[PDB]
């Protein structure tokens, strides 16, 4: 029904080295959908994504990603707006 969201880094995170932060989103009827990556709750500027979509059942598979250098204390999250959602869903990165 509503989108599935996973948030995870390309590697076991270590601080001061370069890794990638991924947001995988999947569901149905995506033409409208808006996905942001967040650092300390504010949008990350340069972010890329790859989209895969099928008309038969209107399924979609999106992957938003950014090269980032994690630290001890910087918090990172994914935000997703969709029609099915009355209010945007947030998923916090964990480790």
């Amino acid at each position, epitope marked *: 029904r509503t989108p599935k969201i996973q948030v995870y880094s390309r590697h076991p995170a270590e601080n001061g080295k370069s890794n990638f932060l991924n947001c995988y989103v999947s569901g149905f009827h995506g033409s409208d959908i808006e996905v942001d990556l*967040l*650092k*300390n*709750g*504010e*949008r*990350i500027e340069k972010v890329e994504h790859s989209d895969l979509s099928f008309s038969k059942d209107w399924s979609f598979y999106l992957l938003y990603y950014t090269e980032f250098t994690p*630290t001890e*204390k*910087d*918090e990172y*999250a994914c*935000r997703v707006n969709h029609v099915t959602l009355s*209010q*945007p869903k*947030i998923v916090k990165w964990d480790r």
Partner: nanobody, 128 residues
Framework: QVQLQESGGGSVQAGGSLRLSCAAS????????MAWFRQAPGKEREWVAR????????YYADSVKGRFTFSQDNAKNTVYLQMDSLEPEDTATYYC?????????????????????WGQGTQVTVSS
């Protein structure tokens, strides 16, 4: 330029509730992130809470998690921090801090204090 509106402090019986309030005029597009610190007698400064400029992400100090919650007014101009289940240890002066999203992004969420624009502070006294 940026003017803080910060309020709500006073005296409360322990176990009671108290709503702090913050807003700021002067920001471009009224877009600004916001955090609360408090200073109590006998302790260092303590970070309490943080909300982002879009107002849909909140981080809280473990010390207040489950007790303190951000909300917004109907008009959306002001942000509230609802403090329930107050204990005497929460007696302190509370301050809010604001800055533009571009800077806020690099101000660490739990603890970061690099905000340019602060309130003078509102005092909360929790008696037994």
């Amino acid at each position: 330029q940026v003017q803080l509106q910060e309020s709500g402090g006073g005296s409360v019986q322990a176990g009671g509730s108290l709503r702090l309030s913050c807003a700021a005029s002067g920001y471009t597009d009224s877009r600004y992130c916001m955090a609360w610190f408090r200073q109590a007698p006998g302790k260092e400064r303590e970070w309490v809470a943080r909300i982002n400029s879009g107002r849909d992400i909140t981080y809280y100090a473990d010390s207040v998690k489950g007790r303190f919650t951000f909300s917004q007014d109907n008009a959306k101009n002001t942000v509230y921090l609802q403090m329930d289940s107050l204990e005497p240890e929460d007696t302190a002066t509370y301050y809010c801090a604001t800055d533009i999203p571009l800077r806020c992004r690099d101000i660490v969420a739990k603890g970061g204090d690099g905000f340019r624009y602060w309130g003078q502070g509102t005092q909360v006294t929790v008696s037994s």
